[model samples]
Target chain A: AADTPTACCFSYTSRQIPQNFIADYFETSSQCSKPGVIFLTKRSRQVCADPSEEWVQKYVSDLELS
Target chain B: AADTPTACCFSYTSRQIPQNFIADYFETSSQCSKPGVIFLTKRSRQVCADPSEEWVQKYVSDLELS
Candidate 1:
């Protein structure tokens, strides 16, 4: 699905996605094809898009804020 | 603790735990012992191997991306 994951400073989205995804994945049905996008860590940032595509080659440029 | 945490828009395992443990990690819901899997983000199309356990590792390089 994906090629290489870009390192997102924060797993940001449009903001609507997180709540929706979380609700869907855990509640309605977590179709891996459609994953609820969330960050490993919460911060003042947003991902560039919705959930990442699955089953492909990707990489993230991780950074730590502390 | 991880030396470098690679950011995974897609962390895949087998076909089991995603649902089984989703409950365990999140709530009183029924997580079917296994560790539930979560997607942090997406690639235009994206992709952890489990078991073969070890200390936290990095990726692409000496990482710890998130």
Candidate 2:
């Protein structure tokens, strides 16, 4: 199970997630062609978003800083 | 990323999910003590559930049979 892409995203949602709704995040697996940020919402939902998007980039940066 | 437990569940929601909401599901990693089934919703949300629960087990068995 460890050596499998369980949470890989094939596509991304364009909707901008509110920063406060995000609890944590991680980069998508390298095996996935579409680079993405998997945001773990405070409600425990997974939201896949394009990493290149401005809001998504900001969330990643903010999370890393915290 | 492949060698990591990206979708591990530490706890599970007791709510019984409608079968139609689930698009797919996978078992939690061996590293996790609490065995779970991670149901991928049609809306792309991840719902962690206790595998021992009757409804959860039914969904798993049904999915496997399909």
Candidate 3:
């Protein structure tokens, strides 16, 4: 396809997320300079004060996959 | 954040595909191609004779999210 970034989230979808994904979210902090950036992007794998709120919802929804 | 070419994908996901989700597969069309160069890099949503054989399984799997 000619699309460039139409499938943005795919960058992260390549791997299987674990049940304790929260810890993984925090680990991403090392990738970024600050927690605010993670919170701002609303990227799926950031651990901030808001952790477990948004990304948590993704996992809960994943249960339906089963 | 640099924020360029955000995410990659099957080539389409900014929008939603349906349960029938066959073209549902990411109907990506190139600005310079025919039938949008469907299925060379192993994309989804192409209607080749083998179309359903590929995309259909994606839906039947119910959000396999691969």
Question: Candidate 3, A38: how far from true, in Å?
Answer: 10
Candidates 1 and 2, the one with greater lDDT:
2
Q: In candidate 3, which residue ranges exceed 4 Å CA deviation? A: A1-12, A23-58, A62-66, B1-66
- In angstroms, the error of model 1 at A10 is 22
Ranking by DockQ: 3, 1, 2
What are the DockQ scores of the candidates, in order? 0.09, 0.07, 0.12
Alpha carbon deviation, residue A21, candidate 3 (Å): 2.1
Candidate 1 lDDT (Cα, 0 to 1):
0.26
Best by DockQ: 3
Model 3's CAPRI class?
incorrect
The lDDT ranking, best first, is 2, 3, 1
Candidate 2's TM-score: 0.50
lDDT of 2 by residue, B1-66 (tens): 222224556567767888899899998766444467888889887888888889998999999899
The deviation in Å at residue B49 for candidate 3 is: 45
Which tens-of-lDDT digit does each residue in B1-66 have in candidate 1? 211112332344443322212211111112222232232222212223322223112121122232
Indicate the residue-level lDDT of A56 in model 2.
89
lDDT of 3 at A62: 49
Q: lDDT by residue for model 1 over A1-66, one digit each (tens)?
A: 332222322222433324222211111124222333333324323233344533100112122211
* Model 3, C-alpha of A9: deviation from truth (Å): 2.8
Q: Which residue pairs collide in model 3, if any?
A: A7-B8, A8-B7, B21-B24
Model 2 stretches with alpha carbons more than 4 Å out: B1-66
